[PDB]
Amino acid sequence: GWVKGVMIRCMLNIWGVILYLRLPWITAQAGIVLTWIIILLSVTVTSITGLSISAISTNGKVKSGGTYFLISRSLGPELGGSIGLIFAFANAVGVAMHTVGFAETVRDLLQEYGAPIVDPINDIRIIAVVSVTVLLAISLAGMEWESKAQVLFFLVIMVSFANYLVGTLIPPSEDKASKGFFSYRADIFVQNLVPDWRGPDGTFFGMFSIFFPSATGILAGANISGDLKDPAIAIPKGTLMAIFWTTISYLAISATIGSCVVRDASGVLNDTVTPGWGACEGLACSYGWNFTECTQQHSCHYGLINYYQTMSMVSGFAPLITAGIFGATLSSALACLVSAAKVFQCLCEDKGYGKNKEPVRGYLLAYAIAVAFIIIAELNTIAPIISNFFLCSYALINFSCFHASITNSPGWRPSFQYYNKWAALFGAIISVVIMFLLTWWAALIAIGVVLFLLLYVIYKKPEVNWGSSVQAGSYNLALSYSVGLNEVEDHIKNYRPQCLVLTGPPNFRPALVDFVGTFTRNLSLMICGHVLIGPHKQRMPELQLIANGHTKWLNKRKIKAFYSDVIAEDLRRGVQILMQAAGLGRMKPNILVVGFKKNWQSAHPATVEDYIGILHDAFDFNYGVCVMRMREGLNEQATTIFQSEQGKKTIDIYWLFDDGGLTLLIPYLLGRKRRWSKCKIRVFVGGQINRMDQERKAIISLLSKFRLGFHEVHILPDINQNPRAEHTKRFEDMIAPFRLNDGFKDEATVNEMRRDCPWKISDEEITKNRVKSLRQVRLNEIVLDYSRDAALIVITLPIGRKGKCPSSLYMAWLETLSQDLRPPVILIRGNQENVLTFYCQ
Amino acid sequence: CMRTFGYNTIDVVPTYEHYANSTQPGEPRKVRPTLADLHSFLPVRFGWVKGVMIRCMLNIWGVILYLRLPWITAQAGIVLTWIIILLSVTVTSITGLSISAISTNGKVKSGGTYFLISRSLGPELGGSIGLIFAFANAVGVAMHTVGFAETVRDLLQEYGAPIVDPINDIRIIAVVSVTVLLAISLAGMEWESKAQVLFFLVIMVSFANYLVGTLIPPSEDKASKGFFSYRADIFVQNLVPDWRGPDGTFFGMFSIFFPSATGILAGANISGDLKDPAIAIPKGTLMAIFWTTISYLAISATIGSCVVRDASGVLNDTVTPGWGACEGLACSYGWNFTECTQQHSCHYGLINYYQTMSMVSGFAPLITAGIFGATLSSALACLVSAAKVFQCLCEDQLYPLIGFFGKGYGKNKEPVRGYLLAYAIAVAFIIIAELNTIAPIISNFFLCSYALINFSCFHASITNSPGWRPSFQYYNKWAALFGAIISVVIMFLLTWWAALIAIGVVLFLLLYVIYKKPEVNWGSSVQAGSYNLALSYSVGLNEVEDHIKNYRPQCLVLTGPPNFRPALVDFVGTFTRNLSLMICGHVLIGPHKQRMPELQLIANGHTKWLNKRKIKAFYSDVIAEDLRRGVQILMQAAGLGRMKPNILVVGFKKNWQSAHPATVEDYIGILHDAFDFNYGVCVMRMREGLNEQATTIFQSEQGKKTIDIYWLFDDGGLTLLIPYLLGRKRRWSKCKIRVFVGGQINRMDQERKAIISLLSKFRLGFHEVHILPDINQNPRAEHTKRFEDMIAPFRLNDGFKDEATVNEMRRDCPWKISDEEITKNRVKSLRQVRLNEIVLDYSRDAALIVITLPIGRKGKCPSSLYMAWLETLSQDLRPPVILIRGNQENVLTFYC
Numbered sequence A: 001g002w003v004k005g006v007m008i009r010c011m012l013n014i015w016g017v018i019l020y021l022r023l024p025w026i027t028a029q030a031g032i033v034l035t036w037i038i039i040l041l042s043v044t045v046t047s048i049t050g051l052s053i054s055a056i057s058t059n060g061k062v063k064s065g066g067t068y069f070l071i072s073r074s075l076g077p078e079l080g081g082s083i084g085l086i087f088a089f090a091n092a093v094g095v096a097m098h099t100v101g102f103a104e105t106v107r108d109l110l111q112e113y114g115a116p117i118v119d120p121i122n123d124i125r126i127i128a129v130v131s132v133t134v135l136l137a138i139s140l141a142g143m144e145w146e147s148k149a150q151v152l153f154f155l156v157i158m159v160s161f162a163n164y165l166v167g168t169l170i171p172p173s174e175d176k177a178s179k180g181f182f183s184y185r186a187d188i189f190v191q192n193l194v195p196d197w198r199g200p201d202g203t204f205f206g207m208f209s210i211f212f213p214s215a216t217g218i219l220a221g222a223n224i225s226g227d228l229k230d231p232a233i234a235i236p237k238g239t240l241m242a243i244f245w246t247t248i249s250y251l252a253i254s255a256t257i258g259s260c261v262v263r264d265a266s267g268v269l270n271d272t273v274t275p276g277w278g279a280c281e282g283l284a285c286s287y288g289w290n291f292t293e294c295t296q297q298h299s300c301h302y303g304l305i306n307y308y309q310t311m312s313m314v315s316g317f318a319p320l321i322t323a324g325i326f327g328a329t330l331s332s333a334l335a336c337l338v339s340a341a342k343v344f345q346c347l348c349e350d351k352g353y354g355k356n357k358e359p360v361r362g363y364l365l366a367y368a369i370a371v372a373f374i375i376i377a378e379l380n381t382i383a384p385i386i387s388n389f390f391l392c393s394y395a396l397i398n399f400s401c402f403h404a405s406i407t408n409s410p411g412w413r414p415s416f417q418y419y420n421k422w423a424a425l426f427g428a429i430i431s432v433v434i435m436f437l438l439t440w441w442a443a444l445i446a447i448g449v450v451l452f453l454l455l456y457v458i459y460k461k462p463e464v465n466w467g468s469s470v471q472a473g474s475y476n477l478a479l480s481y482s483v484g485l486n487e488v489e490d491h492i493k494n495y496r497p498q499c500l501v502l503t504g505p506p507n508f509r510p511a512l513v514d515f516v517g518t519f520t521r522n523l524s525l526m527i528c529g530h531v532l533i534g535p536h537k538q539r540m541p542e543l544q545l546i547a548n549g550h551t552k553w554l555n556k557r558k559i560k561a562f563y564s565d566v567i568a569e570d571l572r573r574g575v576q577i578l579m580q581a582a583g584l585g586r587m588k589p590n591i592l593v594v595g596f597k598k599n600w601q602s603a604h605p606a607t608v609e610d611y612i613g614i615l616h617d618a619f620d621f622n623y624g625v626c627v628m629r630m631r632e633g634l635n636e637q638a639t640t641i642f643q644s645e646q647g648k649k650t651i652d653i654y655w656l657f658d659d660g661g662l663t664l665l666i667p668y669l670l671g672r673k674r675r676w677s678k679c680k681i682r683v684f685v686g687g688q689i690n691r692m693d694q695e696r697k698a699i700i701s702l703l704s705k706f707r708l709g710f711h712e713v714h715i716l717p718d719i720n721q722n723p724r725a726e727h728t729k730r731f732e733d734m735i736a737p738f739r740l741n742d743g744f745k746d747e748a749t750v751n752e753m754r755r756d757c758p759w760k761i762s763d764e765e766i767t768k769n770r771v772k773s774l775r776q777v778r779l780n781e782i783v784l785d786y787s788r789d790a791a792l793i794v795i796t797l798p799i800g801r802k803g804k805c806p807s808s809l810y811m812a813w814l815e816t817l818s819q820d821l822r823p824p825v826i827l828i829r830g831n832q833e834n835v836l837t838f839y840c841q
Numbered sequence B: 001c002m003r004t005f006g007y008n009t010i011d012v013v014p015t016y017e018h019y020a021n022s023t024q025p026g027e028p029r030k031v032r033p034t035l036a037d038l039h040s041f042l043p044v045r046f047g048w049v050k051g052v053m054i055r056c057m058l059n060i061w062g063v064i065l066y067l068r069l070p071w072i073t074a075q076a077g078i079v080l081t082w083i084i085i086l087l088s089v090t091v092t093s094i095t096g097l098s099i100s101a102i103s104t105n106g107k108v109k110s111g112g113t114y115f116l117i118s119r120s121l122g123p124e125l126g127g128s129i130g131l132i133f134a135f136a137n138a139v140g141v142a143m144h145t146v147g148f149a150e151t152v153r154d155l156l157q158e159y160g161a162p163i164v165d166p167i168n169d170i171r172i173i174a175v176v177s178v179t180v181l182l183a184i185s186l187a188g189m190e191w192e193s194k195a196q197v198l199f200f201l202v203i204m205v206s207f208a209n210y211l212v213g214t215l216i217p218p219s220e221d222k223a224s225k226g227f228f229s230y231r232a233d234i235f236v237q238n239l240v241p242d243w244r245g246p247d248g249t250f251f252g253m254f255s256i257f258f259p260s261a262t263g264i265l266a267g268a269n270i271s272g273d274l275k276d277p278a279i280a281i282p283k284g285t286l287m288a289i290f291w292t293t294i295s296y297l298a299i300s301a302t303i304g305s306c307v308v309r310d311a312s313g314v315l316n317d318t319v320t321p322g323w324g325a326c327e328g329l330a331c332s333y334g335w336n337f338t339e340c341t342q343q344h345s346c347h348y349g350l351i352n353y354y355q356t357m358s359m360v361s362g363f364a365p366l367i368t369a370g371i372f373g374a375t376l377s378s379a380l381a382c383l384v385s386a387a388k389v390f391q392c393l394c395e396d397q398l399y400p401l402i403g404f405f406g407k408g409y410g411k412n413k414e415p416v417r418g419y420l421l422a423y424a425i426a427v428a429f430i431i432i433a434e435l436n437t438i439a440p441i442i443s444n445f446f447l448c449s450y451a452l453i454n455f456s457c458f459h460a461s462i463t464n465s466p467g468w469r470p471s472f473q474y475y476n477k478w479a480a481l482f483g484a485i486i487s488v489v490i491m492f493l494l495t496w497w498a499a500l501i502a503i504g505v506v507l508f509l510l511l512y513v514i515y516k517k518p519e520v521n522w523g524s525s526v527q528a529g530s531y532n533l534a535l536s537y538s539v540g541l542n543e544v545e546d547h548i549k550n551y552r553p554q555c556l557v558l559t560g561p562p563n564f565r566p567a568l569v570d571f572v573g574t575f576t577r578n579l580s581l582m583i584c585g586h587v588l589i590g591p592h593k594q595r596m597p598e599l600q601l602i603a604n605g606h607t608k609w610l611n612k613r614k615i616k617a618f619y620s621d622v623i624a625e626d627l628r629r630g631v632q633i634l635m636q637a638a639g640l641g642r643m644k645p646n647i648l649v650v651g652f653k654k655n656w657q658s659a660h661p662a663t664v665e666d667y668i669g670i671l672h673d674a675f676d677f678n679y680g681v682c683v684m685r686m687r688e689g690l691n692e693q694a695t696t697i698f699q700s701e702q703g704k705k706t707i708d709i710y711w712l713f714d715d716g717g718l719t720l721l722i723p724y725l726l727g728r729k730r731r732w733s734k735c736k737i738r739v740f741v742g743g744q745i746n747r748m749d750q751e752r753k754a755i756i757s758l759l760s761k762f763r764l765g766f767h768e769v770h771i772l773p774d775i776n777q778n779p780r781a782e783h784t785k786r787f788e789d790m791i792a793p794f795r796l797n798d799g800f801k802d803e804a805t806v807n808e809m810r811r812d813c814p815w816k817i818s819d820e821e822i823t824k825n826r827v828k829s830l831r832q833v834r835l836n837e838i839v840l841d842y843s844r845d846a847a848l849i850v851i852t853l854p855i856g857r858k859g860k861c862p863s864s865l866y867m868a869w870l871e872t873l874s875q876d877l878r879p880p881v882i883l884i885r886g887n888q889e890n891v892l893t894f895y896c
């Protein structure tokens, strides 16, 4: 935290490996004032970031677990996700860069003995792959060994720095002159005071970019901060102390480098001459080192910019310096990898491997990113990426903190004495400007990537992900989309038939379920209703098991539908309950499907009264109605007639009245399935005998505007003609036993006799509906000579006004329309509202 | 007798008018009877040849026909030109198939491409697409005009009479020409269509002239330039490629030729002016594409057989015997071009000359006329399309300021406003006269339009709503998807930075539209897709078996009108959001049973109100004679599959002391039924009362106040889950939870060890614990007196009555208490008053209070008595008070 987090492992991330290896080179190629200015700017950015980070962090009682968790809990998830993503990418890239640097340093140290294995560049790649793999192996080695090694590494770094200070001030010596050291010289400081450049990066902004990579203490105050036993007043003090120590130490090291170093070397130990014999001038006249040809032809084997590492030859204890620098770099790399792995795990903390169940997947992904970026093996190019990504993360964090302070977040009131919104705004602006100037295209691309991640990771749908399992995820998705459907409004183009099918137990009547499932499959909603008769105190354990078994039987058949059971005294009341309550939001039924009463004659008229009352209630609630009739009745698994292909047969529609199109829509959706996609479809309409031609061409035109693709049309001009004499008689015998026989008295004086049997007919009444009933039986004749071999028959259902059409007269009509056929007859009626259109709004 | 079917009843027969939503020559409009009346008691228009095909054909033909195609065929050979043409045709034909498929679904109105794309895909993408489309057309007009000016200036200089210089004459001529075009477009579509036919005639005459010229034997000038009439040897020569220069690669020729044929929407853009668009768009577009492709192939093949690749052009170079050494087949007909073909420096031939197709023909002014006509036709088409698209887009009022445009004029609504806007933009652009750095932007915009059209088709097909029924059935969705992908690929393959800019503009406009929240509804594939996903995921959840590991609190809240008691809604929504189902109930009494549109409107308004406060709940209403029956209905039937409630949340009836006793009877009956259904129960209570937007204490900050929990009965831990889930939020995060864990008062409490173990398993962070053993103690007799006073009015004073005859008096007054019951329920009535003593000494400054809800056996308690215990328990307290008792099921499965 302070060394392994601030100034040892964050040393190589602030003032360490990336400073103990190639800091003196930048300082020499820049000068004292320029290096001081770069250090000042970096320190300012880091200090503002650290102030904001600590002030935000110290808000509320702290429960350990991760800085990502803390930031998310303080600023919400919207910004927390983006912050975590940016930190993950930056940590992986930094691990890659530090590992490459350490491998290169180790390879050079080994090469100091003059023994090449493979090549200058390739060998570095091999060593780096080996080191990264070793870290991956040591991913889960131990816990307290880490702290022990941190203490040991801090001690070793301190000892190496002491040795470096002891050996740095080299007095006059041939061994020193071999490297160029000449101790203190005012002319040396004068030379350092001026600028000088060499290389493609010979621009001060290049020095700024190089220095930015080694400032991971402020982040160390953000990512290496949440390890304080007393979280109250532990964090900010550590941040300030680490930052100040780093700054002072860096300034001192730069001062020593500029004081006791030279900018040129010789390359030959005994390269000296006498006065007047051979070129010799400059301050080298003290040690006779001329490089005029060497200066001209970039001939500096050793020197400030000539050689990358001057301190290694400047310190007396070379092995100690090498060992300490290598240890510091390894510690920094391990810390960064640990941080990225923690980010991944804490993201997935709530598959698990081993006790901790740690996410090996995230650490493996971090290793993948680091290995992908580490093959290049060049610090000069790599470091700018680290600087840019880290600066983007820090700027986003500070700006978000300032925004939260400004907007008065619901639960934002951090207790930081020195916190101020204006400082956050200033830091955001300055950081943005510096990131833009450092490298235009790269920084802009990173900003665009960050914006994409911030916009496109907050519309996922299941934003919680509770209880990782199958049932849990399924429930989460179902809830998310069901709630989402609430904001979307309704339009005619997207009408859908939601069906409530009265099946009772589904294993008693499978024809209805087959027929409805045919045309509703993955297009709209289907519910199967079951009413339980009798009074009982519900609850009980067995009802749930019964429902579960019914749903299992349903599932085994590959039928998408929901089962549902209710308790009521009688069928009508349970049906009312189902019609009024069942559904969710906009997924609620609007059509009722009911079977035919095969034996309505040998039964108590009370049952018939209730049956007709069901239809009356359905019409009251604005539903559509469908009555299905089979010749044989409806009451491994059984096999039905809708599970075997139909063939070339026809579908016959008798559209006699306008309902809104429901009579036409149901057959259209049914022929769109590969079971009824070979049947030709016929439409019958009534008309006139003296205008048959002007009626055929008109209905055909209307059919083409709905774009339903139906084949033929036929007109019927004789629907008013008198029925046969032997057929109109069969209608009288059918209703004979329902004649109250009081058709000579006041309608006031016929309501009393109906209070015990409100299902009779009045001789007055039969005189008003005489015409209508005749048209009912005449229709049956028309269907028998037209549709004796069809695969389906559809007819519009007639309506009777409540209070003027007893339950017995109504039941006498539907039985007449459908008789003597081999019927899959369907009688349909819409709610008197358009469900089709020929318009695009 | 013989009379129309329908004259003797109330029901009407089907007819066109019942579905037509417009006026008519017949002013009185017709409607069919509503279900309540049957139930219940007591203008110049163009065809397809002149309105679609001619426009598209003119728009496709350009200037590469005369000045570039022969050079391309000389550089690449016949076969490679044919392949390039074929690829371009595949892309264009697929796009045309998609547009035809989308164009026939209902009646299309004015608006062209924008109308189709938007109304069939949704306003959000349609707005940005329309904006960019109009801009692109308004710039293409200027591009074509500058091209025409270039041709005129080049000819005039050829005749040797220049005015100022290459750069200023272009400006002047272009300005004058654009002015003339603007003048033409304002005179009406009749004059506009006449000029199109005139230009078509001129181009046809040019084609015929070239064809006739390509036949006559060659003269001396033509012979010394490479023209020799159809010769099999030249044709044989001219099939292999011969690349030359920096621009000699297959990619280069494809990039040159591809933009030349992409103007295929020139006829659909005037869709508002057609006779029958659904029979006029597809046929015209396909025929135009076919004819243009035939013409391109014919030109390529014919020219590739008459001209040699090189020719000196000097008449003296003829082959006489003695001088020169002939090479190539040019010396088979008696001509010698050894010199230049050796040094590679002559200026004639197919691969070195640009105006070859005018040399071959018999009269060059005809070719000049052809170029003029092509350029001018393109400019006119672009102008008209841009004006119409802009008028239609500005009609819909989707942007803040551009609405000024959209005012029509006499008879046909003619947007002179948009005409002037586009003319001014075109002038401001033609002033520059240098546009080679502005062309790729426009091309990529057009390609984006292609991609959007194709994706609209594919998405509509894949969703497959019952309202998707097109008459044109000669397409396929996979091909459309491939077309959109290849469109974007080509975009990024032409010029990458322009593609980046185009896609960025599309994205930014889409974001602004989505943020603006349009106020219109037309019916799109997106809404149908949302229904699709809801249904599919519900079915998926239902498919899986049932198991205990997915407990969640699913609540039905009795709230009546949602905006009456908002505190209950806010409290439940606080801990329900993103985690479980919430439902709002409302019982309307109603005589009888019916549903009129008033109920539908009221419900839609309630749903809008609920969705306007960031609340996730379903609103449901029922009709019943009293409250108990409606609550029974909702408890029995609400839900779907697995998502159904298992907790009931109700508010306190603070006016129970002054009310007809049957009301409190039904309240307690509601509680008893809920208990009997295996539910959990929550009773909410506040000191004031529960009955733009109004505020509430549940939507404000809390600070550091504490929460007190009084756990006296082990019911499954629901008494602890609700307070716990309310402490993971950003508004209760600083509150401290105090637990007064009389661990199990009547539940075999644990003294010290197990008390902190159960709460430990709840990962609650419990920060404090206390012990209350003094329940039995005698409460201050002063407080007991307050209890006898309220129970007095319900006394039956039946001490001397037998237990058999006591039931007699209750057949009319079931609420009243008995005497034997007072002495029977005495010890259990002292705990309530005594417990109220303790609470009034700790949680007097506590944000919330939670206590275990007492219970009662049916019949063993008089109803009015049980309502006395509730009042005494929670009374004289400032904060909101919650009483809970769980279903007695393990709620510990919720954790992960």
Ligand SMILES: Nc1ncnc2c1ncn2[C@@H]1O[C@H](COP(=O)(O)OP(=O)(O)OP(=O)(O)O)[C@@H](O)[C@H]1O
Binding pocket: A502, A503, A504, A505, A509, A529, A530, A531, A532, A571, A593, A594, A595, A596, A597, A598, A599, A633, A634, A635
């Ligand atoms: N318990 C029930 N739940 C839901 N609907 C029912 C129930 N019982 C009957 N129905 C509906 O009533 C219709 C037919 O009435 P009913 O069953 O009395 O005639 P049925 O089928 O001939 O009788 P049965 O099978 O006894 O001969 C069925 O198609 C069904 O829709």
Ligand SMILES: Nc1ncnc2c1ncn2[C@@H]1O[C@H](COP(=O)(O)OP(=O)(O)OP(=O)(O)O)[C@@H](O)[C@H]1O
Binding pocket: B558, B559, B560, B561, B565, B585, B586, B587, B588, B627, B650, B651, B652, B653, B654, B655, B667, B689, B690, B691
């Ligand atoms: N129509 C209704 N639908 C659903 N719940 C209702 C309805 N009417 C009342 N309630 C519920 O019954 C509870 C008690 O209401 P009651 O009318 O018994 O006393 P109250 O004093 O009117 O209650 P409040 O002061 O909360 O309105 C309320 O908290 C409310 O949640």
Ligand SMILES: C[C@H]1Cc2ccccc2N1NC(=O)c1ccc(Cl)c(S(N)(=O)=O)c1
Binding pocket: B059, B062, B137, B140, B143, B144, B259, B260, B261, B262, B263, B264, B265, B266, B378, B381, B382, B385, B442, B443, B446
């Ligand atoms: C971009 C300019 C410049 C140019 C140069 C050559 C060929 C066409 C051409 N223009 N493009 C068009 O005319 C064009 C392209 C695509 C489309 Cl759909 C259309 S349009 N008017 O059909 O909508 C026009």
